[PDB]
Design a protein around this ligand. Sequence first.
Ligand SMILES: OC[C@H]1O[C@H](OC[C@H]2O[C@H](O)[C@H](O)[C@@H](O)[C@@H]2O)[C@H](O)[C@@H](O)[C@@H]1O
Ligand SMILES: [Ca+2]
Ligand SMILES: [Ca+2]
Ligand SMILES: [Ca+2]
Length: 703
Amino acid sequence: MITHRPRGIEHPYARSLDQLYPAIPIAGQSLTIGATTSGPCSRMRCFVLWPEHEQVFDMSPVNGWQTSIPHLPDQDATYYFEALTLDGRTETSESFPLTPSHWSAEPVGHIDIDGDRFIPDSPLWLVSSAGTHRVKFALRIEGDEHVVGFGERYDQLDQRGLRLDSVVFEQYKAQGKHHRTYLPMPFAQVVNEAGRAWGFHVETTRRTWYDVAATVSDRILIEVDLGFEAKTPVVRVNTWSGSPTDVLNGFLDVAGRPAEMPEWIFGLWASGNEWNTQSLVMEQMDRHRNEGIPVSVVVIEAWSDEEGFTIFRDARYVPNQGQPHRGPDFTYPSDGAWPDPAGMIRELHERGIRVILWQIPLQKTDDDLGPEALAQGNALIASGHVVKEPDGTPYKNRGWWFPNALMPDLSTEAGRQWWTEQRRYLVEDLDIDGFKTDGGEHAWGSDLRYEDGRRGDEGNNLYPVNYARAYGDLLRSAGKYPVTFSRSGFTGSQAHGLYWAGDEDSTWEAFRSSITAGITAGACGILYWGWDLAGFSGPVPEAELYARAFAAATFMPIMQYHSEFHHHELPLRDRTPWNVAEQTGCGELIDLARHYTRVREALRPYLVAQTRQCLQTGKPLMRAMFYDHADDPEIWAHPRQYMLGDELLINPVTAPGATTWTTYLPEGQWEDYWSGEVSEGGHLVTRAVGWDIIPVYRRVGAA
Ligand SMILES: OC[C@H]1O[C@H](OC[C@H]2O[C@H](O)[C@H](O)[C@@H](O)[C@@H]2O)[C@H](O)[C@@H](O)[C@@H]1O
Ligand SMILES: [Ca+2]
Ligand SMILES: [Ca+2]
Ligand SMILES: [Ca+2]
């Protein structure tokens, strides 16, 4: 048969071979029409039925076929495809509607917005006979203003001069180079060089695009998807002005505010994907103890049966019909991977170490699965609590990671509870302390259905917010802090747990990119942020990178090392101080990890106290210079310097071969963290940088 889907697979940054490009066809511009066949074909044509004119296009093959209409007429039409199979059948497709759109400056909708930066007659509305699909409007920016926000960004702090968008996506590595993110938000601050700021927030969970004075040097062009249903269009844009802090506080009053968190999150977090037995985990924690490199949290990713992510690997149990297990349901073989998971967790607690288990918001449907995971899958579908296609059947994951997996519907209390009830015994009976809530970026499709009544145009970006929320609520209901550790999010994510910057190679550019990610994330109210120090993917980082990154990571909100799955191949890829020391032949890295973990522990009361202040003030912890020094033009030339709380100015060393490093100190008296040497502000200062030093300066208080 012939397959044609007007929007295609709806990969946000890519197009399939069976769609219209553009997906919302535009009168005047060109229209590319693709379709696929399930068997081989010698020929295919596209018939287009306008009122008085018929046209037939000989499509060219890329089993994909394609043609294009160079200048699209402004009339409603219909189209269908005719293919000739190699065996001589003529196949014919369904009938499809073509309703070309145009931009009009007529008051089709209303943009509800205050403040004097809105351009009164900039609104353009993309309209057809089907309705109103997108709006395009503008805000003016002045020659001394800088733009920071749009969530976690990996390319640069100041977004002025760039074209970007805000859609949840998984960009596997090089997020900076590709200009994408796991955690965007349709919000930004605009900060001038006299200390005053304004901000804006497009109140939607639909996709938004921004041209931040790239095309028009004094205009921020905003484009907003109005969505599948296409209803009289009203777009609400919240706005604030005052100090940079007033503006971020504005947004948090709407979006949500960070939670209180227990002090144990500020110790070193140990992680490695190939710690996949109880003995591998304990071997590493005993090594931490014996080396004097204290760890406060261990993350176990490869803990489960790798089918349902609810049961420890090799656990034995009576089969359930998909209802939740309790802890006494399980017997653990002595010679299995996890002989006594409750015993591991108890012992680790007795040592002061908390345990976190990886989770994914996907239910595998491989044909390899055992009976328990199939039953768990059928029970999820049977509950109704599954994201659905327009036809009502379950959404099958369109990615190549976990292909065709189901996606639990976490849009309602009942669906979140259904999903997390399967995991409750882990918290209540085995006593885990939290979850690495990975993923959430898998929902592609404008026309998907959620139980809250949203379609995919609004629900898909909202998914990771609901997802982190789900597990937080599980943990609260079990008497524990909502320590979730997530990589994706949206407006609302501020209130739900901790965040890390995702997947990167072990490179200097990724180190730089990660700093930028933490600062930008802080600037949109993601307070509890971390990253995989020195990178998690590929060969172990070179010694110099690990040294510089470990140092930097000591002065960031969440400090952890992690390593990617590598099939248990050789050499070992752990980012442990000892493995990186052995692979690099630099035994000194173990001492250095001792040194900086001692600094980390001494830093913990400051991290606790400054976090508490951040909750009241609204200011980030990992804090861009403009929050306290926006009246100093010179801060913008040093965008990878940042404040850690009110008192410390941090400047990581991000270049190999560096023996000195230069820092810009803002106005005031400053004190070298390591030597006590006093410098006066308003000046550049230079520091020797042995690997035991990262430039850090403390404000000099009154005597
Ligand atoms: O064993 C659990 C799980 O491990 C790997 O995935 C973990 C990986 O997922 C994302 O990429 C995160 O961003 C990383 O930090 C994590 O290490 C395997 O790929 C997966 O198949 C397996 O189920
Ligand atoms: Ca049972
Ligand atoms: Ca005790
Ligand atoms: Ca198979």
